[PDB]
């Protein structure tokens, strides 16, 4: 057994068939010594007197709120949720694996630049007795995370997604990270615990936003354009500093730039389609700016 | 995200040309590996070519059948495979290889993606 | 009297060299300190140069030393080798045991592309306004 | 939401055999299991077995482990109760429930139950 | 030493328009992205636009996208702000800040290092 948070403990079951789980010994949080009994839940049976109470905890039937009275009044609350392992794996029932970048994919992180702020999202198929918490660290408690928030709801399958923002506190965007940030999730469904982690650098979770003002200047010769376009607003500055790489591609014919322009050839029916990158640094491509010929 | 194409049902002494497609980058100054797995069994190093092309490896079971190659902008290598035989039926896997060392002999610290199968009617 | 713009080439062809070396205890870091951001080159670019040109000795005598040049032996044709020449050209530009140790090459080669961003974004910036 | 149809029951002689049935309409989460109960007159309700539709172990109560077999068919939608060597003791209302928080013997921990279907063992 | 120095509030007319000036010193314009915000009586603090002053890119916030013109002259190293079509609601004080190093051209106002005093925008009905 081990504290989640105040009056809220999670008893690691390792199980199968035949038993035989975890003797727990719950003790009751106030001064008093005396006249102290248990119940579990939404019943009224005695299930111990004293300050303590031994459990056999073998299955979910032994988790729930255990409360602790005294001349009919309640002391305290001791919730037991369970973190079930089967064949030596963890239970991932609330998050759904996302299958993307690779298998066992449960938590998504994002950042549009530098600043040391990012976003987290994970997919769920449970819509009722459901809660998150999202903690996180650099290594060091320089991060601080938001409430995790229902950001959209798919349909057929009926998955809600959830996303969270967190932010460095310290951030130094022009310098080197040596130290990982560590994300956490706990998931609780009812009485199942459950545990997500991702560790990271900002620098290999970058995706920019797209190019923006994509416009066409026409030249001398006929289906011969210059196109331009400009950073996106969410990105670091200086961009003197924080410099972008470009991929300019004819849809319907590919050019890499670190400039903000390119002369192609434009078919009519065509279009001229715009992605970013960081210059310096392999991170991800930003979604693609697009303008017609 | 290299993909992988070429694949198909062939007969014993048969032929099929493999292709890895990389987007979105160039494969200028990749060493790029061909693994393949069979229905069961463990992932095997099939070929491999080093950043400039000079430098081949093939597998024992492959040799003077198989013959990789990088091609010219394309950003694309190619696996020629010659003189099919049941034996080399399997789901063949395209990956970044530095230095060839999987390929080579040594162990490497994975995959990605899907494949494309192969299979020899015997 | 720093050469900016023969820098920020250089800086730049290292971050491709860098990556082109893999795709994807114990070393150098450009940290908060350093003056590596547009005010502290504007002030005095020197203390930021300096813990660059620190940073590429000790990665060169690294990618020089038994960890590089052992088992399994790196193809002829490595960008490992451009990559050691290019940290020197750069360095020179400022002031003028089995296996299996591929996992350490790797902790290097990671923490190296890390290290050549910073350095070409202070050239870059420097480049274009000093 | 889902609902649970048990069948299968009726009068047996006592050293037969019967299974029972438990048709679901769906299921509310992948890793839902279903879980058969019992009501027998005088006593309490209490927990047989549970599968989950996802597969793995089941969970028998020790009172009926192997005499008593749960499987399920994810092509039919319905888990079944083998039971074997039947004794006038077995005569009870057996019931069917879906949960979310396999395992469990707990009937609180069953949000969706079937009527029943009515098991006579005659001695 | 570093100053961020507004002028040209006044009294307008719905339909108005007006020019808005930020004198910075003693800092360079090219190594900073300079943002506008603008404080409506009795309202948090809004951002409006911002700039990056080495590209010329600009950012507009919803509420004046088509209506606000950000500029810059790096040699007299002053930022503008052209407000057309002005409206009752855009009544503000209006502040010159300064863009943190690594932040966007949207970036919250905790993410400015330095502000001006502001300048009165009154937009009378
Ligand atoms: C996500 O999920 C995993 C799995 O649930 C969590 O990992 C567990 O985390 C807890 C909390 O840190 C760990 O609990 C600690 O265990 C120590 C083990 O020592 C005992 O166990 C051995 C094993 O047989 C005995 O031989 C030995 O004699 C001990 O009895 C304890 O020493 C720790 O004690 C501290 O906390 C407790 C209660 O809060 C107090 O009683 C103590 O005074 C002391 O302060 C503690 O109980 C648990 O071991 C971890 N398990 C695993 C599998 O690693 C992650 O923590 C959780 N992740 C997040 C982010 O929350």
Not at chain 2, 15 to 37: K, N
Not at chain 3, 34 to 49: A, I, V, W
Not at chain 5, 40 to 47: F, I, L, T, V
Not at chain 5, 82 to 105: F, H, I, K
């Amino acid at each position: 057994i081990w504290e989640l948070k105040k009056d809220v403990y999670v008893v690691e079951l390792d199980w199968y068939p035949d038993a035989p789980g975890e003797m727990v010994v719950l003790t009751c949080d106030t001064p008093e010594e005396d006249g102290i009994t248990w119940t579990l839940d939404q019943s009224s049976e005695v299930l111990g007197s004293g300050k303590t109470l031994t459990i056999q905890v073998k299955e979910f039937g032994d988790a729930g709120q255990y409360t602790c009275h005294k001349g009919g009044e309640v002391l305290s609350h001791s919730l037991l949720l369970l973190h079930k392992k089967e064949d030596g794996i963890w239970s991932t029932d609330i998050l759904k694996d996302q299958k993307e970048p690779k298998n066992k994919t449960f938590l998504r992180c994002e950042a549009k630049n530098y600043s040391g702020r990012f976003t987290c999202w994970w997919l769920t198929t449970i819509s009722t007795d459901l809660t998150f918490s999202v903690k996180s660290s650099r290594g060091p408690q320089g991060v601080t995370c938001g409430a995790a928030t229902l950001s959209a709801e798919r349909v057929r399958n009926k998955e809600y997604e959830y996303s969270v923002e967190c932010q460095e506190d310290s951030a130094c965007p022009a310098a080197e990270e040596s130290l990982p940030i560590e994300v956490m999730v706990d998931a609780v469904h009812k009485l199942k615990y459950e545990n997500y982690t991702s560790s990271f650098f900002i620098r290999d979770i970058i995706k920019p936003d797209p190019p923006k003002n994509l416009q066409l200047k026409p030249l001398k010769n006929s289906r011969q354009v210059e196109v331009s376009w400009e950073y996106p607003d969410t990105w670091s500055t200086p961009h003197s500093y924080f410099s972008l790489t470009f991929c300019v591609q004819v849809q319907g014919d590919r050019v890499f730039t670190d400039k903000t322009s390119a002369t192609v050839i434009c078919r009519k029916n065509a279009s001229i389609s715009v992605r970013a990158q960081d210059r310096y640094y392999s991170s991800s491509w930003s979604e693609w700016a697009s303008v017609p010929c | 995200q290299l993909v992988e194409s070429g694949g198909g049902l062939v007969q014993p002494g048969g032929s099929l040309r493999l292709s890895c497609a990389a987007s979105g980058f160039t494969l200028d100054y990749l060493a790029i590996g061909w693994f393949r797995q069979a229905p069961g069994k463990e992932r095997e190093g099939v070929s491999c070519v080093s950043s400039s092309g000079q430098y081949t490896y093939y597998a024992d079971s492959v040799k003077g059948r198989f013959t990789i190659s990088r091609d010219n902008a394309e950003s694309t290598v190619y696996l020629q495979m010659n003189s099919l035989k049941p034996e080399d039926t399997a789901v063949y896997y395209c990956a970044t290889d530095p230095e060839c060392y999987r390929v080579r002999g040594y162990y490497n610290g994975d995959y990605w993606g899907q494949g494309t199968q192969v299979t020899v009617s015997s | 009297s720093p050469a900016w713009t023969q820098c920020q080439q250089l800086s730049q062809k290292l971050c491709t060299l860098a990556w082109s070396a893999h795709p994807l205890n114990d070393v150098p870091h450009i940290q908060c300190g350093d003056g590596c951001d547009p005010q502290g080159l504007r002030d005095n670019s020197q203390f930021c140069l300096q813990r660059i040109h620190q940073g590429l000795i000790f990665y060169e005598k690294l990618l020089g030393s038994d960890i590089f040049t052992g088992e399994p032996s790196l193809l002829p044709d490595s960008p490992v080798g451009q990559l050691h020449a290019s940290l020197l050209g750069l360095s020179q530009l400022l002031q003028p045991q089995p296996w299996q140790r591929l996992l350490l090459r790797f902790k290097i080669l990671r923490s190296l592309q890390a290290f050549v961003a910073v350095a070409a974004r202070v050239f870059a910036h420097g480049a274009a306004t000093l | 939401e889902v609902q649970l149809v048990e069948s299968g029951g009726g009068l047996v002689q006592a050293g037969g055999s019967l299974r029972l049935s438990c048709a679901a309409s769906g299921r509310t989460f992948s890793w839902s299991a279903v879980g058969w109960f019992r009501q027998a007159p005088g006593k309490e309700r209490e927990f047989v077995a549970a599968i989950r539709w996802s597969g793995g172990s089941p969970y028998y109560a020790d009172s009926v482990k192997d005499r008593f077999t749960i499987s399920r068919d994810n092509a039919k939608n319905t888990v079944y109760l083998q039971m074997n060597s039947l004794r006038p003791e077995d005569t009870a209302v057996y019931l069917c429930g879906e949960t979310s928080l396999f395992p469990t013997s707990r009937g609180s921990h069953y949000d969706t139950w079937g009527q029943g279907t009515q098991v006579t063992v005659s001695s | 030493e570093v100053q961020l120095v507004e002028s040209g509030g006044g009294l307008v007319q719905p339909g108005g328009s007006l020019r808005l000036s930020c004198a910075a010193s003693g800092f360079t314009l090219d190594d900073y992205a300079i943002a506008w915000f603008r404080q409506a009586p009795g309202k948090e603090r809004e951002g409006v636009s911002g700039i990056d002053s080495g590209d010329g890119s600009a950012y507009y916030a919803d509420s004046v996208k088509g209506r606000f013109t950000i500029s810059s002259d790096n040699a007299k190293n002053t930022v503008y702000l052209q407000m057309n079509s002005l409206r009752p609601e855009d009544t503000a004080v209006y502040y010159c800040a300064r863009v943190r190093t690594g932040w966007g051209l949207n970036a919250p106002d905790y993410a400015m290092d330095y502000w001006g005093k502001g300048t009165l925008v009154t937009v009378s009905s």
